[model samples]
Target: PKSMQCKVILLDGSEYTCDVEKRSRGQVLFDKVCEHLNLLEKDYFGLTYRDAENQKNWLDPAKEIKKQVRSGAWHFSFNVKFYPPDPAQLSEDITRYYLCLQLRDDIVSGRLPCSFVTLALLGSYTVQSELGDYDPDECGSDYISEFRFAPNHTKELEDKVIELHKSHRGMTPAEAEMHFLENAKKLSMYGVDLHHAKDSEGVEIMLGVCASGLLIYRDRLRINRFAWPKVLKISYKRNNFYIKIRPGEFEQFESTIGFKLPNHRAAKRLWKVCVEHHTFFRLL
Candidate 1:
């Protein structure tokens, strides 16, 4: 039987490898990583969710996890198989390989996002190689399409941002108001345009609102610019030595910390139910 292995190339350029023999596919491992990336922590850069109460800068974890489940966080899995190249394949193959190598380097260096990653990997071959002498557009071989993280997944982070603000206590009320106001301002730019609202309805409205929130607070420093001394300095609960969201609180309390909660009654209520209680990753 074939076995599955996993390896990660860390940001520091070191590699570590591991093996998996799960009863199922690598679903469990994928879920764990996805949760870490999306649901399990606040503050992607500084790992702020771990400090003590009155000294914390994150929402209670027990509260955050439930919110994630309700938001429909998800990911998809697929596999690709590479053909073994014949030694006699010829010259075009060589050019294609060199171009792909260059493209890969570009992606690894962060010059391109994943959308272009697939393009660089396959575009040169389609255009220059003799694999199929037909136009890619006509042949339906266009592989440069944009890719996205699972649907509703990005919202998980947005919700987390809201929760972080809710849990911390030291911010002056004026500072907090300005914080949200600034977030609303940024969101107004590319996210959801209100002046153009009448043309959009239903999900479009929701999408615009969601986008606005995303544009806001994209940088940690933006929030700090207006934060009070305590809000700015507290170690986040996730960064501390203890877990703050008690298993007991998952069912009882219901208040949101950050911003971006849905306006639709059902979505708003359901989100509150989900995140108000759950355990998340301890950020590093």
Candidate 2:
């Protein structure tokens, strides 16, 4: 069996190197990555790569290794896919530790969007996990000073952390992580995998299908919602996705909404998400 060396790029811009057999499946590589990183909550993440068409595609564990690694493309990106409900299910301290690391990076990079209050609260949780007990002497430490505070609001961020830390007094690191995970799970976009596309008007939008229903967003702000009950049917043809809705009493005309995605693949992916969501939530 031929073996090849590949690099796993983590969410925080760190890299891990490993060798895998050409005959091995994608899951084999994925497991190797988790093992090398000593990661917990492995199910919450996935390895993704861009195809020749520049479309993002997740590495399918069932697919053979050679099929995934194209010529000159040996680096795969690791990213959060689904956030699990219980932090205890993570099974290892290192996993939660890495999660905290990713959360901190997300805040700094502006990937995880939230209000200042929300960011401050989550930031406090991160501090609790990283620094453990708050110290007056450590307040001016380099580690604390290195935190990437929001622009024009460094003082507010610091004050918020101090105020929040008071409430978390005497908590252990593990306990603090649990609290953070619980609150983070409540976010609407939590555990949601978003796909970008455009409406008929050529306006950019994001589509996310979860157990609840289809969520539409313009950037991070949600513009509309289509609950399962309200959705009569969903279908796609070519590059267009159609959502048939049950008409409300006050509604008139246009029971179906249509969106034109970038390509057939994108439209189909959205359709597949809706099918899986309906199957998981509506069917046994």
Candidate 3:
């Protein structure tokens, strides 16, 4: 009660309070939140809030907590700042579990869209987790009626979930969860936060950031996936987001291409996300 307070909304949408000393840095508050979860491998996570102008800012570790967090109305959310290329590399179950929560939230919120069959498969795993092993006697026709995975949730989709859910009858909830991530991790747009940007040729393109690498999707289907091994650097000038690529084995020179973001602010936003994605995934 002696110092400032901050409310952090977790991935599952529950709120937790943290005590902050006046002169303490943002990293102190960050450590406080991660320690609450007992999350040791937490380099990828951060606290974020939006301002009156609706620009999102990650609370900088070095700045005083009060400086960056002044808002007329405040809402700080704990988010996975940098996603792991593979969740298995994360040493703890809590980390993986939290990531699953975020991914599923994205799927349900329509940011991470998948086809109907894949959506039903995901729901099937989700149902298995919620109900444990299926009980034909216990769960009747309305077994999964509570869930609305997509806007066009149809009778056929519900039937597919019921049918597929039957196959996961023997899995532990944890096993079912892992199976869910196994499918979720490999989907077409699992972790892409698609940014609207144009190509060097001026045709429309979506610049997507991925934990595994970077991609440029033409009409939401990825045309080029620049794996971490070959992508050399990323930068921005004016409003152009630039990508520097290493040449093929026989090529004489490397190449740099700048894709135009909508504005300077967007270019910076995309730049920061790409920079950290490369740093967090490749080096760490």
Highest lDDT among the candidates is held by which one? 3
TM-score of 1: 0.18
Candidate 1, residues 190-251: lDDT per residue as tens digits?
11111111111222212112211212233335321111111111111221111122223447
lDDT of 2 by residue, 1-284 (tens): 77888788886578988888868788888998887787756765678777777776677678886776565376788766544545666777766666666665555655556677877777787777667767777675323445554443467677787678657778888878777776666666655657787888899888877656788897555578887778878899999999998889887853888998888978886886687566545632
Tell me, by TM-score, which candidate is best: 3
State every prediction's TM-score relative to the real structure. Answer: 0.18, 0.75, 0.85
Local accuracy by lDDT, each model: 0.27, 0.72, 0.79
Which is the better candidate, 2 or 3, if ranked by TM-score? 3
* Superposition-based RMSD of candidate 3 using all C-alpha atoms, in angstroms: 2.8
User: How many clashes in each candidate?
Assistant: 28, 0, 0
Question: Worst lDDT window (10 residues) for model 3?
Answer: 66-75
Scored against the true structure, residue 214 in model 2 reaches a CA lDDT of 83
| Candidate 1 lowest-lDDT run of ten | 191-200
What TM-score does structure 2 among the candidates reach? 0.75
Q: At residue 279, what lDDT does model 1 achieve? A: 12
Q: Which residue pairs clash in candidate 3? A: none
